[PDB]
Amino acid sequence: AAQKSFRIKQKMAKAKKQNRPLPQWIRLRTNNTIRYNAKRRNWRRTKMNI
Amino acid sequence: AISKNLPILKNHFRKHWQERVKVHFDQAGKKVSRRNARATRAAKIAPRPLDLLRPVVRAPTVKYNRKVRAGRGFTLAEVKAAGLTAAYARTIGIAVDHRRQNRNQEIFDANVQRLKEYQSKIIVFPRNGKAPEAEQVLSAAATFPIAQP
Amino acid sequence: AKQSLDVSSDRRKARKAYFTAPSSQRRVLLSAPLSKELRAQYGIKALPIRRDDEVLVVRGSKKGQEGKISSVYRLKFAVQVDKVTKEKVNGASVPINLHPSKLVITKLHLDKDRKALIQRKGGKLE
Amino acid sequence: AGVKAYELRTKSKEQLASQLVDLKKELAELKVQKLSRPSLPKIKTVRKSIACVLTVINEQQREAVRQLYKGKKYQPKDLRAKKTRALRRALTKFEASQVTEKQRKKQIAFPQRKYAIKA
Amino acid sequence: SEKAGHQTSAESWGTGRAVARIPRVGGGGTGRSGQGAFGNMCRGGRMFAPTKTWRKWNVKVNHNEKRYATASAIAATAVASLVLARGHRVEKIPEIPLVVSTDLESIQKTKEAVAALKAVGAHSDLLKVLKSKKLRAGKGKYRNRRWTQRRGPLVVYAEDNGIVKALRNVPGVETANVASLNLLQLAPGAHLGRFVIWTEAAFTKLD
RNA sequence: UUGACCUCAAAUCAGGUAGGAGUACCCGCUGAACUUAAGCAUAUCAAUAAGCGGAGGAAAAGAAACCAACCGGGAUUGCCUUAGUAACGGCGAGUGAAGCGGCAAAAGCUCAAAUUUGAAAUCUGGUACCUUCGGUGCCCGAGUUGUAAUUUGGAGAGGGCAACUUUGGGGCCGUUCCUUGUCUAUGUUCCUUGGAACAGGACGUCAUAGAGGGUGAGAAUCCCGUGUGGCGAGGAGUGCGGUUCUUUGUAAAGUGCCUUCGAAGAGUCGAGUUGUUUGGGAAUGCAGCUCUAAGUGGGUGGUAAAUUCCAUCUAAAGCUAAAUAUUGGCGAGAGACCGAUAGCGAACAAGUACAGUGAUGGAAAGAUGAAAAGAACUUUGAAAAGAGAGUGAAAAAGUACGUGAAAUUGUUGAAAGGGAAGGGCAUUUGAUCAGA
RNA sequence: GUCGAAUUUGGGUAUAGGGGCGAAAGACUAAUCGAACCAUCUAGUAGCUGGUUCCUGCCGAAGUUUCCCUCAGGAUAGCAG
RNA sequence: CGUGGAGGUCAGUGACGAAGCCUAGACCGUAAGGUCGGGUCGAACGGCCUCUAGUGCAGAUCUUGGUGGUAGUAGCAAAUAUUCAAAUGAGAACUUUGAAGACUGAAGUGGGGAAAGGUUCCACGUCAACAGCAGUUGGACGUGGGUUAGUCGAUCCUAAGAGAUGGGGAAGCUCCGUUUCAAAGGCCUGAUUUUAUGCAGGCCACCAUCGAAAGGGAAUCCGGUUAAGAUUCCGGAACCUGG
RNA sequence: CUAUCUAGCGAAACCACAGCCAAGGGAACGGGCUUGGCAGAAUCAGCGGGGAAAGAAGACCCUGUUGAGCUUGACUCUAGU
RNA sequence: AAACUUUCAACAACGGAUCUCUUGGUUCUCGCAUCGAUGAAGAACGCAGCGAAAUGCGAUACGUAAUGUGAAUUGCAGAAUUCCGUGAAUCAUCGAAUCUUUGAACGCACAUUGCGCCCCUUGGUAUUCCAGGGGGCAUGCCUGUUUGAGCGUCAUUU
Ligand SMILES: [K+]
Ligand SMILES: [Mg+2]
Ligand SMILES: [Mg+2]
Ligand SMILES: [Mg+2]
Ligand SMILES: [Mg+2]
Ligand SMILES: [Mg+2]
Ligand SMILES: [Mg+2]
Ligand SMILES: [Mg+2]
Ligand SMILES: [Mg+2]
Ligand SMILES: [Mg+2]
Ligand SMILES: [Mg+2]
Ligand SMILES: [Mg+2]
Ligand SMILES: [Mg+2]
Ligand SMILES: [Mg+2]
Ligand SMILES: [Mg+2]
Ligand SMILES: [Mg+2]
Ligand SMILES: [Mg+2]
Ligand SMILES: [Mg+2]
Ligand SMILES: [Mg+2]
Ligand SMILES: [Mg+2]
Ligand SMILES: [Mg+2]
Ligand SMILES: [Mg+2]
Ligand SMILES: [Mg+2]
Ligand SMILES: [Mg+2]
Ligand SMILES: [Mg+2]
Ligand SMILES: [Mg+2]
Ligand SMILES: [Mg+2]
Ligand SMILES: [Mg+2]
Ligand SMILES: [Mg+2]
Ligand SMILES: [Mg+2]
Ligand SMILES: [Mg+2]
Ligand SMILES: [Mg+2]
Ligand SMILES: [Mg+2]
Ligand SMILES: [Mg+2]
Ligand SMILES: [Mg+2]
Ligand SMILES: [Mg+2]
Ligand SMILES: [Mg+2]
Ligand SMILES: [Mg+2]
Ligand SMILES: [Mg+2]
Ligand SMILES: [Mg+2]
Ligand SMILES: [Mg+2]
Ligand SMILES: [Mg+2]
Ligand SMILES: [Mg+2]
Ligand SMILES: [Mg+2]
Ligand SMILES: [Mg+2]
Ligand SMILES: [Mg+2]
Ligand SMILES: [Mg+2]
Ligand SMILES: [Mg+2]
Ligand SMILES: [Mg+2]
Ligand SMILES: [Mg+2]
Ligand SMILES: [Mg+2]
Ligand SMILES: [Mg+2]
Ligand SMILES: [Mg+2]
Ligand SMILES: [Mg+2]
Ligand SMILES: [Mg+2]
Ligand SMILES: [Mg+2]
Ligand SMILES: [Mg+2]
Ligand SMILES: [Mg+2]
Ligand SMILES: [Mg+2]
Ligand SMILES: [Mg+2]
Ligand SMILES: [Mg+2]
Ligand SMILES: [Mg+2]
Ligand SMILES: [Mg+2]
Ligand SMILES: [Mg+2]
Ligand SMILES: [Mg+2]
Ligand SMILES: [Mg+2]
Ligand SMILES: [Mg+2]
Ligand SMILES: [Mg+2]
Ligand SMILES: [Mg+2]
Ligand SMILES: [Mg+2]
Ligand SMILES: [Mg+2]
Ligand SMILES: [Mg+2]
Ligand SMILES: [Mg+2]
């Protein structure tokens, strides 16, 4: 809203920090079932619902 | 739903009976556990026969008064006539029942006799003595069977 | 032929225990037999593999090859022996993963703890 | 390879405080360096050294307070034993072994006797 | 599981929506939404007539009928043709029943117990085991039933003075107290004619 | 004016305690309807779901105001029975116990009501010290509107007479149990196949070990284990087995005879009525309201009542292990169970992603290969890629990865084809093929 | 149509399901209203509709009787194995 | 007849190839089916005697998944409108620059905000997917940068209202009520300064708290500055509150 | 401006199998069956005769010992008073 | 005659059936009894050289201490190889600690990272203002302590 509560801003900060692709050195680990970031969020696709 | 010539049935399954169905899958496991508990209790208790001496007693209800069976405990009169006090009999392994009364001299005499037999056939260890290992027997009932007069 | 109620013959449980064994358990799991000479010299049959042990490969395509252990890759359930490698097409070299049950220890890397282990297992003259 | 707690335990609280300050200065310098240098892992050792020094300092302080409260009832609650809440609320061994005078008399007079059937 | 297939709030959409009237998962946004539920024909549904633990598992048999079957099995052990027909490679073997010395009851070591069985002629049956061992066909192999093999001789004794432990590692060989003879061992697979090696004490105690 | 007392307050007073979670099982409250009755209202579902309060490792119950009617049993609980029975019920649909008997486990008890009255003998706390789950001294305080000892109905108490019998708790070393550590057998011998031998064949070895798992394919004998024993470690605990310093105490307890007594629970029992409930039927329990006891009394004795007896217990106060329960928790062992549309919703970063304002709803998704050896290098292309080369046992395994069906599709080949196609009988022709 | 007052509208606040709210249409109460949504009871019941999975061999019907709150159902006798 | 699993047996088959799958190739059976060859493939499986069942599909507007014909079809037609050249690029109707032609026409297609969103802002790299044509461009993708306050808001006040306490109700979850049937108090200081406090002179109360980023309200402006911040930074010049 | 043709892009409804008629009989209005008429690849734009075209387990009507909203000295109750 | 259509085969597609796998589920049995104001369960936000998650943890942050084992961890980087050692490890064990903001949740509030009061202390002359650090302040109830209230009430001076 541009006048947001600190709680909201903290949640947005966490969302920004976790808005990234999978680290590439994962997928090199020994067993590594993980293929991609399946929890990736985008502002144009799925809203955080606060 | 009354079809051809069959007996009228009274199957009581109109409640949520499937919520209370006890299948005794643990019959064998419980038998094993009971035997284990009897063995552990025998080892834990003194070389004492795992059960108290019970009196002979007449069953009520003429359907069963023709037979005799083990009762709960010897009456106070029976213990006194056998020469013990109730507290000491309870400590030396005699079941004592204050509720039961003696109105039958034959049953009273049989109970006094088996109390005397038990006193003659048991060895009470001293409180602070040696009492060399006396080869625990496990069943006072088997040692002193109830005999039908 | 198991007799104790504390051991499980369940294949699912055994496989889970193997594949999720921690590093310390994997050390025991990755044991190698001693060679004939070492068995005679030490009085013991097998020992957990160690990074500086010398081994001889007795099974597989690398059979007959010898070297010193390079790493006990406990995560991979395998050991890597120096000079037992695969030369890739690009010129690089990668270690060959070997299982210690397919090797014989021809020279133990010894220290106080290893000597104590040998004596505890019933070894003579260390 | 960092500090060792058994080595720190031989030092006075002033020496430990000074070493803690030095380790914090070293960590600050290391994280200044981290911005330029790619992937230096030496920060972890200093962080664990700071943790070890703090642990030993707290061990010394808590032991001092334990000595101060030795013997007397009403020690501090974080120095009291942490069993479960129910276990802390349970009767002590003294209680729940308390018996009345009548009960003690009769249990001394007629204890469970040791006996065997011998036939 | 008694709740399998019913952990949903699915309701029938009813008619008029051009789909079958099966109950359907509500909500939206997941793919499970609108899917059929609760039906034995539905993926993720409840099976028809879910199996219950109170199915009858054990079967009561009259004690006398059980003893009749056991006596018949014991008698069949003495018929050479039945023993041959039941596997049990007794071809070059002396008179059946095969009774051996009571010294067999006191053997402590597998080596000497096996040597005694070979001497009295059970070598071919022992070798029939250890050669019939094969991976079980089907899913039973990962239900702790991985391997199958033939049955060897049943050694019957009167007093266990080591023979049971001495023989318990020999594949296919079973041991039995003559006082308690098992039908499941005397007629494995309901097939009469188990190869039975009686000790002398067990043979005398049979009467 | 001072000092009490009683009652009531305050303090961030000294020290504690409750709440919330879990909730499978357990103790209560509250409480349906779908349903069955072929309709339906009593009934049934059901004294159930949902809702609320409260525990534990079990809970609850529990040592008779019991059952009985016998030649009497003798706390409670649970199992097998009683029994689908007595009884209830639009006597319709339906429902439905209990006594006895066999068994599992067994265990018994304590307050109130008593003058210690020649001695509040009792207890919390504070403080000092100590051998600290506590002890001792001192000090306040609580308490006579009653804290100890003594008694609990089986009794028992007060006096009188006579002896006899028995005994308290700590030390140390083992045992009991708990949690753990470590050690303890026998082939990597030869040939064949294979990328790999763990396959087949030969010769052996151990077996109280041929359970199970791993390792490049079906491994007793390669590895871990398994089997059998050995050697330790840290605890809990007095349950017992020995040894020692403690010796309690002219203390406590039990027993015989005579004698005087013998306190035993009230708005409770019981009664009426109302509601609910029960198999309980002129009323089984529970609860509201009104009435409201007695003491050779009171309760019960399954048909209401008056009268006379009899039997059996002793309410209105209390504690208590085991046998019993356990879709929760922790630790284990298993299965004629399921084998990735199955089995839990979830074999996987699943109660995840995602939907909904919200309560809530809630997926899909496992498999290269023994090993990445995950394709160096060349060449065409802007590139993705292709074509080679190469790795590999296999690329008819290339991470769009085991196998790789069908629908549906491309190419190739064969054939036929005037408003469907497909089918049956028969033979021609073409193709193809077994038998002898 | 109305457009300066029974005007339009933001935000805050109140009213919650046999309840609200209604200048009243059974209207509105989150695309849901002659009783919202969510979960559970619940796999509610259905004399009614649909379906009901291998082969061959032998035998082989009934739609009629009586009774029923029965008339799309059942019991009963008959027919059949 | 066939299927999953179980006891027995054939010391059955099998990495020299089990199972599965494909096969207008062969054989047996009336049939359910069974058997063989060839291809593919890679780790198990079968005959017989019995046991057992979650055991046989064409349908259920069946369930889940997958796939067609329709069909390169319907269509991608509202909001006046595009054009020339160059640059970039493998590639330009659509990117960038220039030129031209137009439009919104200040109740904007302009410049800011509130709710909401949450990084979309800005730069660099960059086009597999997305932008129902395209794409070298982008609100995309990858990596980073960025939001500076005594004065602007919140914070404080009370509004409709919400809501503890004291009490009362309710089996209870909780309900009522908001100053009520309550012993509901801190702040002044004589004196005290054995200590500005307790004893002790004396003054005021019919009451928690929440409730507004549009109501009330202490105080800041100009110029400049960034890729992206500005009444916040920088320069200068003020003002308010508390002390 | 579409439709139309082209480049790029690219769905859906629906679909037992399909698609020429006349008459006959037939569940009494056939695309199929019978008897005749006939009948030649592959197609494009239109079109609204037919496919008893699609859309929806007819909402009218009846049946059900299926409801619900509503009403009333229906039956049986009930808050309140 | 092609094209087209249809059928079949081969190869290639599409798709993911089948088969074989299985650290998962399901059911049975056995044993055990241990959440929380000493702050639980749950939540939020953080923490690694390079992590978005899962898992772990709490500013001592994929962890500290202690004990055991006895040389790893491993995707890379880095470190070490004295590793015959109070010593590797994403090891096991676990008794000492830390344990942000919360949450029954406790100074008051909470759509605020809002607002107090007390004590000790440090700095700014500073008991009063501002700031930093440390420690505190919920409610019901119990026992006790202290200070009190009431002609409820006793005695006493009177
Ligand atoms: K209605
Ligand atoms: Mg299922
Ligand atoms: Mg199979
Ligand atoms: Mg206090
Ligand atoms: Mg609670
Ligand atoms: Mg039902
Ligand atoms: Mg009905
Ligand atoms: Mg009906
Ligand atoms: Mg009805
Ligand atoms: Mg309930
Ligand atoms: Mg508990
Ligand atoms: Mg128990
Ligand atoms: Mg209890
Ligand atoms: Mg009594
Ligand atoms: Mg009884
Ligand atoms: Mg009967
Ligand atoms: Mg009932
Ligand atoms: Mg006495
Ligand atoms: Mg071994
Ligand atoms: Mg294997
Ligand atoms: Mg009484
Ligand atoms: Mg009730
Ligand atoms: Mg009582
Ligand atoms: Mg009780
Ligand atoms: Mg699944
Ligand atoms: Mg599959
Ligand atoms: Mg909604
Ligand atoms: Mg797959
Ligand atoms: Mg292959
Ligand atoms: Mg494939
Ligand atoms: Mg096909
Ligand atoms: Mg109307
Ligand atoms: Mg059904
Ligand atoms: Mg016929
Ligand atoms: Mg019909
Ligand atoms: Mg099955
Ligand atoms: Mg094959
Ligand atoms: Mg075919
Ligand atoms: Mg394979
Ligand atoms: Mg089925
Ligand atoms: Mg089908
Ligand atoms: Mg069909
Ligand atoms: Mg369909
Ligand atoms: Mg479909
Ligand atoms: Mg078009
Ligand atoms: Mg259009
Ligand atoms: Mg336009
Ligand atoms: Mg331009
Ligand atoms: Mg205009
Ligand atoms: Mg204009
Ligand atoms: Mg931008
Ligand atoms: Mg496009
Ligand atoms: Mg494109
Ligand atoms: Mg480019
Ligand atoms: Mg971006
Ligand atoms: Mg302002
Ligand atoms: Mg309120
Ligand atoms: Mg406010
Ligand atoms: Mg304002
Ligand atoms: Mg700006
Ligand atoms: Mg300035
Ligand atoms: Mg016609
Ligand atoms: Mg006609
Ligand atoms: Mg037609
Ligand atoms: Mg014709
Ligand atoms: Mg034509
Ligand atoms: Mg038209
Ligand atoms: Mg038409
Ligand atoms: Mg219809
Ligand atoms: Mg309809
Ligand atoms: Mg009818
Ligand atoms: Mg109705
Ligand atoms: Mg905490």
Please enumerate in sequence order all residues whose Cβ is within 8 A of that of C24, keeping only pairs 6 or more positions apart, or say none. Answer: none
Q: What is d(CA B26, CA E57) in angstroms, rounded to the nearest whole number?
A: 13
Q: How far is B24 from chain E (nearest CA, A)?
A: 9
The CATH number linked to C54 is 2.30.30.30
Q: Which two tokens stand for residue C19?
A: 């594949």
Residue E198 CA to residue E158 CA, distance in Å, equals 9
Parallel/antiparallel/unpaired status of strands E174-177 and E154-157 = parallel
**C99: amino acid identity, one letter:** H
Number of H helices, E strands in chain B: 5, 3
- Nearest nt to the CA of E14 via C1' is I57
For residue E30, give Cα distances in angstroms to A34, B34, E11, E26: 22, 53, 17, 10
Q: Is E90 helix (H, G, I), strand (E, B) or coil?
A: coil
Q: Alpha-carbon distance C75 to C87, whole Å? A: 23
Residue C102 vs residues B48, C76, D58: alpha-carbon distances, Å: 61, 15, 51
CATH of D74-119, one of 3.40.1530.20, 2.20.25.90, 6.10.250.3450, 3.10.129.10: 6.10.250.3450
Q: What does the buried/exposed string (b/e) look like for E17-32 if buried means 16 or more CB atoms within 10 Å of the residue's CB?
A: eeeeebbbbeeeeeee
Q: Who contacts B130 (Cβ-Cβ below 8 Å, separation ≥6)?
A: none
Question: Can you tell me the distance from the alpha carbon of B134 to that of B46, in angstroms, rounded to the nearest whole number?
Answer: 10
Strand partners, B8: none
Distance CA B126, CA B92 (A): 12
Decide if E152 contacts E118 (C-beta within 8 A). Answer: no
Residue B143 lies in a domain: no
Determine whether B92 is exposed, middle or buried from the number of CB atoms within 10 Å of its CB (0-12, 13-18, 19+): buried
The amino acid at C25: Q
Q: Tell me which residues from 141 to 170 on chain E have a beta carbon below 7 angstroms from nucleic acid strand J.
A: 141-142
Question: Closest approach of chain E CAs to the CA of C92, in angstroms?
Answer: 42
H helix intervals, chain E: 63-77, 80-85, 110-120, 123-128, 163-167, 183-186, 200-205
Task: Give residue A47's Cα distance to chain centre.
Answer: 12
Going by their DSSP bridges, the two strands E196-199 and E154-157 should be labelled as parallel
Report the 10 Å Cβ neighbour count for C50.
20
Contact C81, C25 (CB under 8 A): no
Residue B51 domain-assigned (yes or no): yes
Residue C62's alpha-carbon distances to B6, C85, C106, in angstroms, are 81, 9, 16
- For B72, other C-beta atoms within 10 Å of its C-beta total 14
CA-based R_g, chain C, Å:
16
Q: How far is the CA of B3 from the C1' of G68 (A)?
A: 15
Q: Which domain holds residue C40?
A: 1-126
**Omega before E97 cis (within 30°)?**
yes
Residue B135 domain-assigned (yes or no): no
- Chain centroid to CA E124: 23
Kind of pairing between the strands at C66-73 and C54-57: antiparallel
> Quick check: E22 and E28 in contact, CB under 8 A?
no
Query: Residue B116: inside a domain, yes or no?
Result: yes
* Longest CA pairwise span in chain C (Å): 55
Q: Which residues of E touch C15 (CB under 8 A)?
A: none
* Nearest Cα to Cα of residue C19 among D117, A30, E108, B46: A30
Nearest Cα neighbor of D3 from D16, D12, B112 is D16
Number of domains forming the structure of chain C = 1
E41: Cβ contacts below 8 Å, ≥ 6 apart: E22
Judge whether B74 and B57 are in contact, CB under 8 Å.
Answer: no
**Residue-by-residue DSSP string for C92-125:** -EEEEEE-GGGEEEEE----HHHHHHHHHHT-S-
Spatial separation of the C-alpha atoms in residues E196 and E156, rounded to whole Å: 7
Cα dist from B110 to B70, B81, E189, whole Å = 12, 11, 57
Nearest to C11 among E144, E168, E169 (CB): E144
Q: Are strands E11-12 and C31-33 parallel, antiparallel or unpaired?
A: unpaired
B113, two tokens: 């006799």
Residues of E in contact with C10 (CB under 8 A): 144
* Resolution of the coordinates, Å: 2.0
- Tell me the two tokens of residue D69: 């409260």
Cα separation, B124 vs B46, in Å, equals 11
- Residue E2 CA, nucleotide F23 C1', distance (Å): 20
Percent helix, strand and coil across chain E, each rounded to 5? Answer: 30, 10, 55
**Nearest residue to nucleotide H115 when comparing alpha carbons to its C1'?**
A1
- Residues of chain B in contact with residue D119, where contact means CB-CB under 8 angstroms, are 121, 137, 143
For chain B, how many structural domains are there in total? 1
Q: How far is CA D13 from CA D2, D60, D67, in A?
A: 19, 8, 16
Q: Which of residues 10-39 of C touch strand J (CB under 7 A)?
A: 11-12, 15-16, 19-20, 22-27
**Residue B119 within any structural domain of the chain:** yes
Taking the C-alpha atoms of residue B36 and residue B29, their distance in angstroms, rounded to an integer, is 10
Say how far C31 CA is from F268 C1', in Å.
Answer: 82
Nucleotides of I under 7 A from a protein CB: 14, 55-58
The sign one gets for the Cα dihedral C38, C42, C47, C53 is negative
Domain that holds residue B69: 21-126
Do the chains C and B touch each other, judged by at least 3 C-beta pairs below 8 angstroms? no
Which pair of structure tokens corresponds to residue B78? 């029976």
Which part of chain D has CATH 6.10.250.3450?
74-119
Q: Please tell me which of the candidates B90, B92, B135 has its beta carbon nearest to residue D115.
A: B92
| Any domain includes B75 | yes
